[PDB]
Structures are given as structure tokens and as C-alpha cells.
Amino acid sequence: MKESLKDRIRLWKRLYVNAFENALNAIPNVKGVLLAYNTNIDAIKYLDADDLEKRVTEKGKEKVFEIIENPPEKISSIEELLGGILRSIKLGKAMEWFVESEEVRRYLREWGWDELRIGGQAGIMANLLGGVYRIPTIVHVPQNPKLQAELFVDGPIYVPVFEGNKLKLVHPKDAIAEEEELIHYIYEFPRGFQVFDVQAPRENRFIANADDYNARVYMRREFREGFEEITRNVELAIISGLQVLKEYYPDGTTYKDVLDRVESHLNILNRYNVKSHFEFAYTANRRVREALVELLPKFTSVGLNEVELASIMEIIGDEELAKEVLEGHIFSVIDAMNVLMDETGIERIHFHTYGYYLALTQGGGRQLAFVPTKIVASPKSTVGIGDTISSSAFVSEFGGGGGVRDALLFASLAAAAKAMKGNLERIEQIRDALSVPTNERAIVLEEELEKEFT
């Protein structure tokens, strides 16, 4: 190893330790955070071969196998549910099909699950920001039956309820309503899982989505009528869930009907000087994707990864730039971030990928912050990591936590800790991530930025 790398390694150890201290001191000063819009139930089943074979045989094995070769890419029957699962196994391929049949939803609920956890970006960040970081959190829960409300951990997590004409903030378990279970059924299998003659070449999962409400970004009454009072209780907002929007729905409504309501919410946030952060998850519909870019001027900040930034370059950049961004080639990523800032005038863009983060901020002219991250070799869990990174940097920076780079370092530690441990319970546990080595390939990469950027 070059001695200059030994020196940089020692400098990054001290920056990481100080950034963790700064985050612990600044996070308690965050008055509150608003999380919207997507919360659901994730039901995990670890597939059993004998069970799955019996269920295929009950319904007609030949009908099921016809579906494997001729997939409907939607679920209207139990045979289509079973055929989709077996196709996911055969291809070792992540798949999600929507369940458009109430009879199949009854079959899914009866079949059950091994593990239940909160789903949706708003919901999982409620458990992290409120449960682990102890930031007072108000979360949008489109449908809050008992099965949904029990999945929130203990802590300062609140939902709004109307007491006649007055808005109260209560724990979700104290606001159970006569509402739909919004369940995403997740069928997991390992490499080598075999039913009949079908064998998985890698681990993967098939998702049966039984959730009509987050599919169209349903907003409950308390958020449509109490939004201004809710806004008075927070300092920050993180907005997610709009990636699902379609241009047209069968009832004749459009994506713009939803985005008009989001824009009204952003106008209220900005009137109260709430700092807002948009999670620009992959939006398959190109027209909605363009509309979301046109909405970014009303946000303080946006977060995205290499897939998400490449996707946006397909509509405001060029195909060659998207291809380079997808591989995380840093000088193309930087160009793409400046293209997005030029297009929108947004104050802040947080890019995260394997090995490093960037933050581009508009201040005394544009500043670029870079950190090498901490990679966990074999993570105990991979779910919610991107949202943890984006939300953790945003709340510690705008919470007063040592500046832009320090907030990125804290997000790197939170991501490593969640990966090491599977599930976080207390913010003190993130200290254990300091022992994860800093990515030395990314440490050395910063030398290329310094030569380029005097």
C-alpha cells in the first residue's frame, strides 16, 4: 500500500468518528418529520416445496405449467398466482404481479405468511426515524386496520386523527380504523429450490401485490383536510411513493390528479419553510417521470441511486450519459447531477451507489461533497437500505449534524449498521459500524476528483 493511502485511511477514520458524534447531537434537535405517502404490509413466506407442489396439483398442474411459458404478467386466478411463482423459480428472477381478483386475495390471506413487517417507504422510515432515531414522526397510513397498525415499533410515531373538528396526533395502534389490509405477499426461495422439474438457479422472490390503495397514491382524509395543521408540527418532510403513477386509470383519472394534490402539499410545506426531500425511485412511466422532474423545483432536496439517476438521464440527458451513470462512473454521475440541477434549480441532490456517495448543493455556488462508504461483505438484510441512506443524510444535515459531508458519513454508518445487524433498534448501535473498513477503492478514487477539480 502507498503511504498516501495509509494517511487517507487514518483521516477518514477520524472524519467518521466525528461525523457520528455530530449526528447523535444534532438529531435530537429535529422538531419533527413528515413521511408520505406509501405504507403497507409486507408478508413474507419461505416457500415449502411439498406445500407448493400440493397446491399446484390441487389446481391443475398442466394449467399452471402453461402459465410458466405464457405468463400473463398479472394475477386473475389462483392458477396464474402459482404459475407466476414457479416462473420466478425457473428463471431465478425477481417478479411482482398485481392481484386483480378478490378470490385470489382470499386464497393468499388464507395461505398466510411466516413473517410480517411494515412495508412502503414511508412506513419503513417511520420505524427508523421515529423508532430508532427518536425523531417525532408523522406518517401517512392510507389504510390502518389492526394488522397494519401493529407493525409500527414503539416510539414517537404518530398518525393524525380527527376528533370531531380537532386534529390529534396519536400512535398508529391507537387509530385503528375499519379499513383494508394492504398486503404485498413475498414468496422467497433459495438457490436450488425445486418443485417438480423446476429448480431455482439463484435465490429470489415472487411478489403478489394485493394493494389497490398505494397503487394510486390514495391519501386519507386527515392528510387531505388536516395537512396544514400537520405541517405546523414538523420541520422536515420526506416524500415517496409516486413512482407507481400511471398516465390513465380505468375510472378516467390521471397521474396529474394525484400530482396536483402533491403540489398543494408542497405549497403548504414551503409556506411553513419545511425542508422537503423527494425519493426519486424508478418511475416506469416516462411521462410521469417527466412530470416529477417538473415538480422538483418545489423540493429542497432529492435522493437517488445509479439506476434512478440513469433513468432520469433518459429524459433530460442522453443515452450515452445514462449508460455511464448506470455503472456509477463518477465523472458521468457528476455531469448527470449538474444536468438535473440545471434543469430544476433544486438546492440539493444526494446520489448514493456502491462504495461512495456524492452530494451536490447550490450555495455559494455549487459545492460537491464526496464520501467513501463502508461495505458489509454479507449483509443480514438488504431491504430498506437505499431509503435508510437517503433519509439519514437528509435528517442529520438539516438537523444540524456537521454539514453536508458529515451527514453523508452518518448515512454510510447507518447503512452499514442496518446491513450488519438486519434490524436496528437504537441509534447507539450504529456506533458498531465504525469498525467496518472504509472502501479503499473509493478512497483512492477521490484523488481523481482532486486532480479534475482544483
- Taking CB atoms within 8 Å and a gap of at least 24, the contacts of 333-337 are 333/306, 333/309, 333/358, 334/358, 334/360, 334/368, 336/309, 336/310, 336/312, 337/309
* Claim to verify: residue 194 and residue 246 sit in the same structural domain: no
* Claim to verify: residue 152 and residue 73 sit in the same structural domain: no
- Say if residue 51 carries a ligand binding annotation: no
Q: Residue 251 corresponds to which amino acid? A: D
CA-CA distance, 398 to 27, in Å (whole number)?
9
The two beta strands, 204-210 and 95-98, are parallel
* Claim to verify: residue 112 and residue 85 sit in the same structural domain: yes
Query: What resolution in angstroms, rounded to 1 decimal?
Result: 1.9
Helix (H/G/I), strand (E/B), else coil: 212:
coil
Cα pseudo-dihedral 339, 343, 345, 349, rounded to 10: -40
CA-CA distance, 343 to 332, in Å (whole number)?
16
* Claim to verify: residue 335 and residue 375 sit in the same structural domain: yes
CA angle 52, 53, 54 (to 5 degrees): 90
CA-CA distance, 154 to 173, in Å (whole number)?
10
Alpha helices (H) along 317-429: 319-326, 330-344, 385-397, 404-421
Residue 18 host element (H or E) = helix 3-26
Q: Which of 7, 50, 387, 406 is catalytic?
A: 387
- Say if residue 42 carries a ligand binding annotation: yes
CA-CA distance, 246 to 309, in Å (whole number)?
20
Helix (H/G/I), strand (E/B), else coil: 413:
helix
CA-CA distance, 312 to 293, in Å (whole number)?
8
- Say if residue 197 carries a ligand binding annotation: no
- Say if residue 386 carries a ligand binding annotation: yes
CA 414 to each of CA 161, 392, 411, 430, 446: distance values in angstroms, whole numbers, following the listed order: 32, 7, 5, 6, 22
- Say if residue 352 carries a ligand binding annotation: yes
* Claim to verify: residue 201 and residue 281 sit in the same structural domain: no
User: Which are the contacts of 11, defined by CB distance < 8 A and separation ≥ 6?
Assistant: none
Asked if 293 and 304 touch (Cβ cutoff 8 Å), the reply is no
Asked if 436 and 374 touch (Cβ cutoff 8 Å), the reply is yes
* CB-facing half-sphere around the CA of 277: CA atoms within 13 A: 29
* Claim to verify: residue 96 and residue 233 sit in the same structural domain: no
SS3 content of the chain, % helix, strand, coil (to 5): 50, 20, 30
Q: How far, rounded to the nearest angstrom, does the alpha carbon of residue 289 sit from its chain's CA centroid?
A: 17
CA-CA distance, 217 to 223, in Å (whole number)?
12
Domain span at residue 263 reads: 1-39+120-180+213-454
* Claim to verify: residue 127 and residue 274 sit in the same structural domain: yes
Q: Residue 165 corresponds to which amino acid? A: N
- Say if residue 120 carries a ligand binding annotation: yes
User: Where is the domain boundary, 169, 193, 212?
Assistant: 212
* Claim to verify: residue 81 and residue 229 sit in the same structural domain: no
* Catalytic residue flag (residue 387): yes
Question: What is the domain count for the chain?
Answer: 2
* Claim to verify: residue 170 and residue 191 sit in the same structural domain: no
- Say if residue 353 carries a ligand binding annotation: yes
* Claim to verify: residue 336 and residue 281 sit in the same structural domain: yes
Map 109-169 to HEC letters: HHHCCCEEEEECHHHHHHHHHHHHCCCCEEECCCCCCHHHHCCCCCCCEEEEEEECCEEEE
- Cross-strand partners of 314: none
* Claim to verify: residue 361 and residue 437 sit in the same structural domain: yes
Asked if 120 and 41 touch (Cβ cutoff 8 Å), the reply is no
* Claim to verify: residue 278 and residue 414 sit in the same structural domain: yes
Asked if 280 and 292 touch (Cβ cutoff 8 Å), the reply is yes
Question: Which residue's C-alpha cell is 427508523?
Answer: 128
- If one counts every other C-beta atom within 10 angstroms of the C-beta of residue 64, the result is 24
Peptide bond into 37 cis (omega under 30): yes
CA-CA distance, 154 to 133, in Å (whole number)?
12
User: Which are the contacts of 109, defined by CB distance < 8 A and separation ≥ 6?
Assistant: 181, 183
CA angle 368, 369, 370 (to 5 degrees): 120
CA-CA distance, 172 to 144, in Å (whole number)?
8
CA-CA distance, 147 to 157, in Å (whole number)?
17
Q: The dihedral of CA 111, 214, 283, 380: what is its sign? A: negative
- If one counts every other C-beta atom within 10 angstroms of the C-beta of residue 256, the result is 14
CA 97 to each of CA 73, 85, 399: distance values in angstroms, whole numbers, following the listed order: 6, 10, 39
Asked if 302 and 289 touch (Cβ cutoff 8 Å), the reply is no
